[PDB]
Ligand binder design. Structure first.
Ligand SMILES: [Mg+2]
Ligand SMILES: [Mg+2]
Ligand SMILES: [Mg+2]
Ligand SMILES: [Mg+2]
Ligand SMILES: [Mg+2]
Ligand SMILES: [Mg+2]
Ligand SMILES: [Mg+2]
Ligand SMILES: [Mg+2]
Ligand SMILES: [Mg+2]
Ligand SMILES: [Mg+2]
Ligand SMILES: [Mg+2]
Ligand SMILES: [Mg+2]
Ligand SMILES: [Mg+2]
Ligand SMILES: [Mg+2]
Ligand SMILES: [Mg+2]
Ligand SMILES: [Mg+2]
Ligand SMILES: [Mg+2]
Ligand SMILES: [Mg+2]
Ligand SMILES: [Mg+2]
Ligand SMILES: [Mg+2]
Ligand SMILES: [Mg+2]
Ligand SMILES: [Mg+2]
Ligand SMILES: [Mg+2]
Ligand SMILES: [Mg+2]
Ligand SMILES: [Mg+2]
Ligand SMILES: [Mg+2]
Ligand SMILES: [Mg+2]
Ligand SMILES: [Mg+2]
Ligand SMILES: [Mg+2]
Ligand SMILES: [Mg+2]
Ligand SMILES: [Mg+2]
Ligand SMILES: [Mg+2]
Ligand SMILES: [Mg+2]
Ligand SMILES: [Mg+2]
Ligand SMILES: [Mg+2]
Ligand SMILES: [Mg+2]
Ligand SMILES: [Mg+2]
Ligand SMILES: [Mg+2]
Ligand SMILES: [Mg+2]
Ligand SMILES: [Mg+2]
Ligand SMILES: [Mg+2]
Ligand SMILES: [Mg+2]
Ligand SMILES: [Mg+2]
Ligand SMILES: [Mg+2]
Ligand SMILES: [Mg+2]
Ligand SMILES: [Mg+2]
Ligand SMILES: [Mg+2]
Ligand SMILES: [Mg+2]
Ligand SMILES: [Mg+2]
Ligand SMILES: [Mg+2]
Ligand SMILES: [Mg+2]
Ligand SMILES: [Mg+2]
Ligand SMILES: [Mg+2]
Ligand SMILES: [Mg+2]
Ligand SMILES: [Mg+2]
Ligand SMILES: [Mg+2]
Ligand SMILES: [Mg+2]
Ligand SMILES: [Mg+2]
Ligand SMILES: [Mg+2]
Ligand SMILES: [Mg+2]
Ligand SMILES: [Mg+2]
Ligand SMILES: [Mg+2]
Ligand SMILES: [Mg+2]
Ligand SMILES: [Mg+2]
Ligand SMILES: [Mg+2]
Ligand SMILES: [Mg+2]
Ligand SMILES: [Mg+2]
Ligand SMILES: [Mg+2]
Ligand SMILES: [Mg+2]
Ligand SMILES: [Mg+2]
Ligand SMILES: [Mg+2]
Ligand SMILES: [Mg+2]
Ligand SMILES: [Mg+2]
Ligand SMILES: [Mg+2]
Ligand SMILES: [Mg+2]
Ligand SMILES: [Mg+2]
Ligand SMILES: [Mg+2]
Ligand SMILES: [Mg+2]
Ligand SMILES: [Mg+2]
Ligand SMILES: [Mg+2]
Ligand SMILES: [Mg+2]
Ligand SMILES: [Mg+2]
Ligand SMILES: [Mg+2]
Ligand SMILES: [Mg+2]
Ligand SMILES: [Mg+2]
Ligand SMILES: [Mg+2]
Ligand SMILES: [Mg+2]
Ligand SMILES: [Mg+2]
Ligand SMILES: [Mg+2]
Ligand SMILES: [Mg+2]
Ligand SMILES: [Mg+2]
Ligand SMILES: [Mg+2]
Ligand SMILES: [Mg+2]
Ligand SMILES: [Mg+2]
Ligand SMILES: [Mg+2]
Ligand SMILES: [Mg+2]
Length: 336
RNA sequence: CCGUGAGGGAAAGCUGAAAAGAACCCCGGAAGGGGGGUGAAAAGAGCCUGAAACCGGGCGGCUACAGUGGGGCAGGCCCGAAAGGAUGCCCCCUCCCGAAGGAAACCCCGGUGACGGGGGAGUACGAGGGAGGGGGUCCAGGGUCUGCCCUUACGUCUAGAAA
RNA sequence: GCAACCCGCGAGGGGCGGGGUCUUAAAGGGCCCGUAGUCACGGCCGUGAGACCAGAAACCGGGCGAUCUAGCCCUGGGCAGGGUGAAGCGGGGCGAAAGCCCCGUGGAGGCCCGAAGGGGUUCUGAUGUGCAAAUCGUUCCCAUGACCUGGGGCUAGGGGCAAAAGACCAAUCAAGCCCGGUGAUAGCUGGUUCCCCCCGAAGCGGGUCUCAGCCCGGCCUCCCCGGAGGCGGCCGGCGGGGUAGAGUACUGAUCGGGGCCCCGGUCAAACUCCGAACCUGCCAGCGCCGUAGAAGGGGGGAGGCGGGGGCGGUGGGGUAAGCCUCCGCUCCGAGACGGGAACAACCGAGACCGGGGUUAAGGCCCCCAAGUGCGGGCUUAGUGUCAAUCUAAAAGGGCGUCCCCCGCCCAAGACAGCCGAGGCGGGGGGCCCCGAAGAUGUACAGGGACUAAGCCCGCCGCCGAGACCCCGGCCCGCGGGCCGUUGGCCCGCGUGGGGUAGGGGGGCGCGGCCGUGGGGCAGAAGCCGGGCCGUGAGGUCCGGUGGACCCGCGGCCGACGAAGAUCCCGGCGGUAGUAGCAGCGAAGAGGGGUGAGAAGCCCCUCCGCCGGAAAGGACCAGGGUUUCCUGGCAACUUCAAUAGGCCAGGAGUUAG
RNA sequence: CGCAGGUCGCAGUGGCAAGGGGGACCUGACUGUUUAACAAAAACAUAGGUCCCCGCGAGCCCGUAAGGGUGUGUACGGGGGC
RNA sequence: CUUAAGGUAGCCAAAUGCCUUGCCGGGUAAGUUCCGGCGUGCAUGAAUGGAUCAACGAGGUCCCCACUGUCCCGGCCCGGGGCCCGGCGAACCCACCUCCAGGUGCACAGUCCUGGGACCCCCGACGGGGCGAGAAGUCCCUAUGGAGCUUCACAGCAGCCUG
RNA sequence: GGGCAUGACAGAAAAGUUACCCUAGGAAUAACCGGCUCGUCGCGGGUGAGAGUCCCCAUCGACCCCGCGGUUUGGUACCCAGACGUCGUCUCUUCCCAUCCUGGCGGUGCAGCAGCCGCCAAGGGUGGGGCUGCCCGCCCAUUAAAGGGGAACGUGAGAUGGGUUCAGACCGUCGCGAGACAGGUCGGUCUCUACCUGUCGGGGGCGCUGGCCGCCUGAGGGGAAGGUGCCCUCAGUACGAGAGGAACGGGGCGCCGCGGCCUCUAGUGUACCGGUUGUCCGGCAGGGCACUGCCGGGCAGCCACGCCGUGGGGGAUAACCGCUGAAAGCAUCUAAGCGGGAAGCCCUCCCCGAGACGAGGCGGCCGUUGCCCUGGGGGCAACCCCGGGGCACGAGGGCUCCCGUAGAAGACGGGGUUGAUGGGGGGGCGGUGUAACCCCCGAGGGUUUCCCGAGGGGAGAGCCGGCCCCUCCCAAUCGCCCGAGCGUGC
């Protein structure tokens, strides 16, 4: 094998490293959470920028407990989501696949939805709800179809993004259906979904970097004593043994970035109502200003500075939950 | 024409009987193109005939869920004027003869049984060879494609070649 | 003589005898004798000649070369700047003398640093279908001298020249180049061109400066002579033999017992009292072949003189080998086809063409034609899945499980801890388990999968080749017959029909000639496509194109047939609208004019590069009109063009 | 060429231009020469040392020969080795 | 004693020591190299030159200081290639042209067997495979093949000496 | 007729050397790799003399014997001489298990701490240096441990080129000699524009049973996405005569790997600002060139030396440990049944994903139509059917346009007047460092103290932004296209 042991260069768990099929993250997994009341299990927001904050450490066993520590934070611009439709799911008896059985739309969808959808002038919502009720007894899951409101964000674009977010919180399917139907035509604000201090998972398409070489793409070494090597140094030496031929595990140049990634256990530090208190006087570089609600996340988030980011309840939460009390954010670097 | 030199050294034939060598009109910057002329024939000065490779266009067949070339059988689409048959070919029916070979239903005897034996029966049938009747329209041949079956480029030394 | 066959004569053939001659004292022996040659035409082969075609490195003859390079000679040119500081010469200081010390002056050196110039170290940099058949960048070495450089001159091939590397002597040097000897030779390598039909090998023995060659035999083929016997099989009569086994008796080896002997035991390629199977000699018979020609003999031509697989000789050797070296049958080579998953030589089996039928090996759950066929038993490990090539397994352990045999106990007081019926041990067999570990991809050995669709003992039917049977067609060998015949046709018979090298027999095509008969401007040859005929080489016809020659038949002759030779010459592709048109320290822009057309030609403005020069001034050799003017753009310039060292037309070089 | 004073920068040989230095061993004394096109060297040469053939009509070498080189020279010389 | 003598002065695990990374010191955290010693030295030694390094070195080597993108360990930037457009417009190579696995076979298959896959076409990149391309293998052997060189080979010819 | 001789004996008269080498050929024949073989090499098993205080088998294993692997070396000569690039290293990927650590279990001559031995197990780890051309090996400091093998001795059309193994040269030795040595030593060209395939990423189309939009599903595919240490407590406790000295559980944090991100810090930053050298533009100011002239600072962007995330569980199992339990009145983990049991396998988790041809589900939008020109046929009286073309209707889509969450080309995303998409203008925030003008100070000198003078101070900064906001002032225009519609059968 190798002359000297060392781990392989880069992961093959993200193979193939192709461009994401869609700029909007498509979430595969939604957790089962018992909150005691029905609620959406996720939210969507626009990444605005990064700052750093002075946060009091509230972990009693932590060596920094009670101290003020500086943490890098990510600001999300989070205008309310507009609920456009409710969809019901059952299980196909032939194979156990989850299958949509129907959906009910708001009668008068907003004009901006017409930029992406082929809609009638009016939906007859009552008939659709009536038809939906026939499938109540075979329902296993209920999701709402939400549209973003980018006009209320700092981006200012008009074309919205549309995605499904399930309703959870209680084990009873019927109450989830009743709660989802009550949301038809209404908006959902981040405070309706999350509470400050809780953990969330974040899913987004990462920043694009175009075609990149094998050194940057996989972390292969530049050939040591770089000047010695004819035909270049930013490369692998060989591209394989004699057999098997080029395998799919061989590092090769290609697209780097613009992939969908999921990161876990990011703490929500603050959910604000008015973004003027967090927007720097210069504005967020390459983004703009935040005028409505915002989410302050501890740490970094995948994606470029205008990407739509999906937050969900965690699917791998740690054994010990964070403290119930809201974290104490003393100061943020965008302030005086 | 090549080598300082001694020396070395190619390729390259054909308008038409006659120039009758293309007047004249339109277009083009021009080479030239279209129309219109000459001649038995463009044979048009890049000049007899004008093959193949090769490239363009048209036509026939195929073409994005199916692994390629060759052969046989069956079929689809297309061609099938002449030089081949059309007294053809194809289908049906009936009749006769028929090599090697050759059942079945059913009755009887045996075996646990797979099956064997006597009769039915050297029958029904059977390559092919003869005769007639009804119906149809091309048949042969060719291009290409599909299905099924078969199939390991050539030349060579070698004990041994798809190597 | 019915025939069978017997008898006589008996050319040719065979044997003797006789004769000529040589040798010898002679006998004996050698050669020769009772008839056929010679000349020609065609063919095959040998030897020479270039000798089927292509191919060396070489060697010799006579010439040509020192514009390159090596050396030397004659006559010209060049080397910024700086540093060090020899001999010699002054002054001062110390000092008793000698002398010593300091400072200066001076300007030596195959001295030092470093431009020009010369050289060529490193990056083992760039380039590596290059700018270039040796270059470029960078870093380097020398740079007043054994220094660098121009012109002229000398030394020439077995010779030169060499501060010597066998360097260099015109991109050529462990012996130049040109032409000639010369088509050098090659046991070696490559190539060697139409069809059908008949037969059909070999890699063995001997000799060889022989081992990649060749010759004489074996094996093939064709022809002729000859004339009745022959032998890959079997039975018998009469013989030969010394292997397997056996023995341990001769020659040897070797373990024990008993008193050099006796008894028991272990052995032998180079031991043998015995002794098979088996092979082999003669005779008789059988069987088959043979007068449609046995034995034997003569002549022509070979190929080949590298073999290989299976099985058998424990062959002999070797740890073993898809190993080396012998002996024998068969098969591949030179043999199609069915089965084996594939697969020259394992099994089956030998193929002219078409069709029908039946079997062989092997198979019958699906792939896949035919059985989810029949009875019994075993295995629980997916063990395994119908011989070999072919992908596997040992010593050993296991009552795991199925089974067989033996010994002992129990006569119901056995085994196990009164109860009541079987119990304990040994030996063996079947299947399976452990022993059992590998490298790209699944219980691999064809795949699916199967608890039988596995294994063992038996059984029934079916499928399945080109084999075997039958029908039709074709061809062949041999024999017979007919026909005025360098040939044609008919009949009969064949347990006739594969074939490389090679031998033998017949036909097709191409160019010409000698004859004969014809076609063609109402359309020859050629060319494109098509129909028909022939097993085939090929022939013939039709439609189109073309524009003047051509063909049938008989005979004769060749500069006579291509798919291939890193073949030759020409043309033309894919590659591909791809590489390159970057790198070496300059580059363009605006406006106007000309013009069919302008980023690029002409004019101005702006911007840049050289300036002890890849760039300004002069000029030798070499080049030879490239100079200048006018006009132009088919070609030429790595793009464009109205430009040009290009093209056309004209002109131009003045000397005491 | 020198002296005194003032003064700025991160940097005053400001760009350009322009030695890294020291210790030791092997080896050839040195400068020089070399495999044009894979070897620049410790190889060749070298000054110096030493030996040999030679008194010139010599020694050594070239030429078929006529003749020639060393030699317009002469042992403090010519030639030949190491 | 053996073909005469019998390695002297020196020098050394040497560019010369196989054994051998010899043994002991130095230097390193760690030293098969290097330096200093040691020496019956496989096989050192005197113009075949021995010992010997001042000066010199594009010679070969070890150590120290300084220094740094050599490295830890990679990042960003600049000019030209690159990529795209316009224009010009080749070559190498080429029997035909090839998805993967495990087999089989002249023993290392694109083409054979049994499997596993694949909608087709196009662009960029690379260099694992095509036993990739280049060059009738220089290695090695064979040939009753060469060339040049050597001498105690077989011969021969000059040159010199001698009658 | 006898003899004189060829012993290489079916009869030439015959020495070397080539690494300066050349030609013809040979896989008839060596060297590398491959094939066969496995003596050798490595690994496993049987046996049990003997050692182990007693005690064969905790640990060993004499004398012998049975095997496996293809990993050393050899044997052979089957393929390849019109050629498969010859050692090592670098880089990069994968596979094996006969397991060094990490997970599980057992034995011990296992008190504890350690150690030794066996079994399951290949998911992950197995590192940094010194010496030598190495490979191997020895050594140093660490470490959980610093395993071994295969892939044409993996990988030179990827590199490197130190050794080996060309031509030059030196030494020792051998040879009369030229020369030779697989003994040492110094020097000594690493060629190719990628045709096919593969791999990695990026596009166009056709299909999915009329066209389209949006949201989903999940067959299968990929994954190591995580691995592994340390400290405290337990506790100076258990154990132990002492010396010494654990563990489960609980708490905290790294190292290596993977995936993101740019707030901080660091790098860069030929946008930008300033200083300054030489020269040129007459001087000042401003500027060219010195290939950013050099130097300092530096926004955005990119980036690591920076920051963030990176888990437990469930199921069936392996080695095995047990329950009940007969065969076999007892006993027995096993024969039926049952319980427990690994970093391994599967799922959970992350990525790709309907070309998943059984081409899927859901909701919605659209089409399911007409007219014109022309050719043919039927009966001709309209008419109807068929061929070709054109136009209209029509959801949706594209080009053109302004751009950037994107980007080699394509693609993707945003905007397009019902509009803040780029620019301009104003404002915010930021870089540099304080322009011009004016006033004061200035070492000293002179037309004497109204001039020169490097420079210092004040007020004012000045220049600039590939960032944010606001504002229609300019430009997102004019336009060019694609598009289902119909039959037939099962
Ligand atoms: Mg290099
Ligand atoms: Mg013509
Ligand atoms: Mg016809
Ligand atoms: Mg007719
Ligand atoms: Mg051969
Ligand atoms: Mg062979
Ligand atoms: Mg062949
Ligand atoms: Mg001859
Ligand atoms: Mg000769
Ligand atoms: Mg001569
Ligand atoms: Mg000259
Ligand atoms: Mg000098
Ligand atoms: Mg070099
Ligand atoms: Mg180079
Ligand atoms: Mg190149
Ligand atoms: Mg100098
Ligand atoms: Mg030499
Ligand atoms: Mg010569
Ligand atoms: Mg010669
Ligand atoms: Mg010649
Ligand atoms: Mg025959
Ligand atoms: Mg041969
Ligand atoms: Mg007999
Ligand atoms: Mg015997
Ligand atoms: Mg015996
Ligand atoms: Mg015998
Ligand atoms: Mg032989
Ligand atoms: Mg044999
Ligand atoms: Mg042969
Ligand atoms: Mg077969
Ligand atoms: Mg069947
Ligand atoms: Mg055995
Ligand atoms: Mg098995
Ligand atoms: Mg025959
Ligand atoms: Mg004739
Ligand atoms: Mg041929
Ligand atoms: Mg040609
Ligand atoms: Mg071409
Ligand atoms: Mg290019
Ligand atoms: Mg310059
Ligand atoms: Mg230019
Ligand atoms: Mg200048
Ligand atoms: Mg100058
Ligand atoms: Mg000049
Ligand atoms: Mg001129
Ligand atoms: Mg002119
Ligand atoms: Mg001219
Ligand atoms: Mg400089
Ligand atoms: Mg020297
Ligand atoms: Mg050279
Ligand atoms: Mg050199
Ligand atoms: Mg010397
Ligand atoms: Mg001396
Ligand atoms: Mg001497
Ligand atoms: Mg001594
Ligand atoms: Mg010395
Ligand atoms: Mg010594
Ligand atoms: Mg040394
Ligand atoms: Mg000596
Ligand atoms: Mg010496
Ligand atoms: Mg000596
Ligand atoms: Mg000396
Ligand atoms: Mg020198
Ligand atoms: Mg182009
Ligand atoms: Mg095989
Ligand atoms: Mg191939
Ligand atoms: Mg490409
Ligand atoms: Mg050859
Ligand atoms: Mg050769
Ligand atoms: Mg010979
Ligand atoms: Mg002999
Ligand atoms: Mg190889
Ligand atoms: Mg070998
Ligand atoms: Mg062994
Ligand atoms: Mg034991
Ligand atoms: Mg081996
Ligand atoms: Mg061989
Ligand atoms: Mg081979
Ligand atoms: Mg080859
Ligand atoms: Mg290769
Ligand atoms: Mg090659
Ligand atoms: Mg194991
Ligand atoms: Mg290798
Ligand atoms: Mg290479
Ligand atoms: Mg390679
Ligand atoms: Mg080297
Ligand atoms: Mg070397
Ligand atoms: Mg060498
Ligand atoms: Mg000697
Ligand atoms: Mg390349
Ligand atoms: Mg998976
Ligand atoms: Mg990272
Ligand atoms: Mg900077
Ligand atoms: Mg100024
Ligand atoms: Mg200037
Ligand atoms: Mg500049």
């Amino acid at each position: 094998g190798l002359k000297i042991n060392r781990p392989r260069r880069g992961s093959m768990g993200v193979y193939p490293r192709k461009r994401a099929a869609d700029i909007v993250p498509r979430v595969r997994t939604w957790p089962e959470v018992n909150l005691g009341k029905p609620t959406l299990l996720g939210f969507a927001a626009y990444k605005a920028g990064m700052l750093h904050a002075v946060v009091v450490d509230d972990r009693p066993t932590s060596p920094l407990y009670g101290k003020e520590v500086v943490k890098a934070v990510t600001v999300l611009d989070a205008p309310p989501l507009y609920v456009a439709a409710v969809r019901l799911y059952t299980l196909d008896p032939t194979n156990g696949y989850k299958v949509a059985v129907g959906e009910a739309w708001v009668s008068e969808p907003p004009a901006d939805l017409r930029r992406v959808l082929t809609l009638p002038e009016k939906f007859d919502t009552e008939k659709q709800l009536k038809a939906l009720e026939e499938y109540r007894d075979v329902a296993v899951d209920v999701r709402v179809l939400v549209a973003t409101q980018p006009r209320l964000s700092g981006i200012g674009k008009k074309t919205p993004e549309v995605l499904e977010i399930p309703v959870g919180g209680v084990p009873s399917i019927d109450e989830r259906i009743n709660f989802a139907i009550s949301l038809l035509g209404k908006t959902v604000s981040p405070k309706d979904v999350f509470t400050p201090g809780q953990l969330v998972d974040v899913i987004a398409v990462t920043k694009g970097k175009g075609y990149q070489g094998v050194v940057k793409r996989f972390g292969v070494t530049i050939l040591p004593r770089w000047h010695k090597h004819r035909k270049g140094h930013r490369r692998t030496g060989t591209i394989g043994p004699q057999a098997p031929a080029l395998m799919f595990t061989q590092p090769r140049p290609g697209q780097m970035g613009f992939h969908q990634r999921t990161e876990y256990n990011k703490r929500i530090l603050k959910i604000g109502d008015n973004g003027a208190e967090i927007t720097p006087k210069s504005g967020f570089p390459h983004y703009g200003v935040i005028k409505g609600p915002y989410i302050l996340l501890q740490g970094s988030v995948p994606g470029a500075r205008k990407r739509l980011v999906v937050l969900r309840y965690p699917v791998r939460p740690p054994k010990k939950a964070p403290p119930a009390a809201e974290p104490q954010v003393v100061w943020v670097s965008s302030q005086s």
